[PDB]
């Protein structure tokens, strides 16, 4: 028999920020230290290893707002 | 027999921030230290390892609002 | 019998950031140190390794707003 | 005062074997099989390890009687 | 005071073997098989390791004789 | 005071073999097989390793005789 699909999501949504100032921000961490010892590394399928990383990050967006949309129709 | 689907979500939502100022922010941790000792690493399928990482992060968005929407229709 | 799909997502959404000023940001991390020791690395299929990475990042966009859209229609 | 030691062991002993024949000897064992699986071997002081050995021995001496002589004098 | 040592061991001992024949000896073992897997070997002081040996030995001395003499005098 | 040592071991001792015949000896082992797998070997002080040896030995002395002497005098 007849199959009919109407997929019609509607979106008027708004993500809004006012800020009067960002400033006087001081990221001043002391000296980090890292050691790793390992004797063999053996990686096979879809492995996503990270070893011994040392990150200092200072992220200061005037907005930094996120809107994420996922729309899926699957038919068999 | 006849199959009819109407998928019609509607969204007028708003995510809103007012801020008068961000500032005088001091991320000042003392010196971190990390050590890892291991004998063999042997990773097979879809492994997502992290070893011995050391992160300092200072994230200061003026907004930083998140709206996340997932819409799925599955038919067989 | 007949199969009919109407896929008609509609989107008027807006992501808005006002910031009065960005300034006076100081990323002054201390001297980091990293060591990694290994004898053999043996990587095969879809491996995405990182070893010993030291990073300092200062990211200060006037916007930094993200709108992300994924649309998938799959038929069999 | 005066110390006198006389160490004077005497030995006239005899170890004797008579045999009319050795023979018609058949060392015919079926095929042996050995497996060892281990992660690490880490040996420190005066270690005398044997791992996974497989011995067939056929020892057929005409005598097999034993003489070894060891003499030690230690003074302080 | 005076120290006197007379160390005067005496030995007339005899080791005697008579055999009328050695023979018709058949060392015929089936095929041996050995496997060893280990990931690291790490040996430090006076280590005397053997790994995965496979020995067939046929020893048939009529005499084969060993006389071993060790004499030590140590003074301080 | 006076220290006197007489070290005077005396030895008339004898090792003796008669054999009427050696012969008809058959060392016929089946085909041996050995495998060893290891990823690193790290040996330091007075290490005496053997790995994966495969010995067939046939030893058949009528005489083959050994006399071994060690004499040590040490004074301080």
UniProtKB/Swiss-Prot annotation, chains A, B, C, D, E, F:
Q: Where is this cross-link: Glycyl lysine isopeptide (Lys-Gly) (interchain with G-Cter in ubiquitin)?
A: 8, 14, 18, 28, 40, 44, 50, 66, 72
Q: Where is this site: Not glycated?
A: 8, 14, 18, 28, 37, 40, 67, 72
Please quote what the entry notes about the protein's domains. Answer: The tau/MAP repeat binds to tubulin. Type I isoforms contain 3 repeats while type II isoforms contain 4 repeats.
Q: What residues of the intact protein does this structure contain? A: 621 to 696 of 758
Protein name per its UniProtKB record? Microtubule-associated protein tau
Under the subunit heading, UniProt states: Interacts with MARK1, MARK2, MARK3 and MARK4. Interacts with PSMC2 through SQSTM1. Interacts with SQSTM1 when polyubiquitinated. Interacts with FKBP4. Binds to CSNK1D. Interacts with SGK1. Interacts with PIN1. Interacts with LRRK2. Interacts with LRP1, leading to endocytosis; this interaction is reduced in the presence of LRPAP1/RAP.
Q: Which residues are glycosylated?
A: 44, 50, 66
Q: Where are the Tau/MAP repeats?
A: 3-33, 34-65
**Which tissues express it?**
Expressed in neurons. Isoform PNS-tau is expressed in the peripheral nervous system while the others are expressed in the central nervous system.
- The PTM N6-acetyllysine maps to 8, 14, 18, 28, 40, 44, 66
Per the entry, what this protein does is: Promotes microtubule assembly and stability, and might be involved in the establishment and maintenance of neuronal polarity. The C-terminus binds axonal microtubules while the N-terminus binds neural plasma membrane components, suggesting that tau functions as a linker protein between both. Axonal polarity is predetermined by TAU/MAPT localization (in the neuronal cell) in the domain of the cell body defined by the centrosome. The short isoforms allow plasticity of the cytoskeleton whereas the longer isoforms may preferentially play a role in its stabilization.
Q: Which disease is it linked to?
A: In Alzheimer disease, the neuronal cytoskeleton in the brain is progressively disrupted and replaced by tangles of paired helical filaments (PHF) and straight filaments, mainly composed of hyperphosphorylated forms of TAU (PHF-TAU or AD P-TAU). O-GlcNAcylation is greatly reduced in Alzheimer disease brain cerebral cortex leading to an increase in TAU/MAPT phosphorylations. Frontotemporal dementia 1: A form of dementia characterized by pathologic finding of frontotemporal lobar degeneration, presenile dementia with behavioral changes, deterioration of cognitive capacities and loss of memory. In some cases, parkinsonian symptoms are prominent. Neuropathological changes include frontotemporal atrophy often associated with atrophy of the basal ganglia, substantia nigra, amygdala. In most cases, protein tau deposits are found in glial cells and/or neurons.
Maturation and modification: Phosphorylation at serine and threonine residues in S-P or T-P motifs by proline-directed protein kinases (PDPK1, CDK1, CDK5, GSK3, MAPK) (only 2-3 sites per protein in interphase, seven-fold increase in mitosis, and in the form associated with paired helical filaments (PHF-tau)), and at serine residues in K-X-G-S motifs by MAP/microtubule affinity-regulating kinase (MARK1, MARK2, MARK3 or MARK4), causing detachment from microtubules, and their disassembly. Phosphorylation decreases with age.
**Where is the protein situated, by its record's location annotation?**
Cytoplasm, Cytosol; Cell membrane; Cytoplasm, Cytoskeleton; Cell projection, Axon
Residues recorded as bearing Omega-N-methylarginine in the entry: 46
Where does the record place the modification N6,N6-dimethyllysine? 8
Q: Residues where Phosphoserine occurs? A: 2, 21, 49, 53
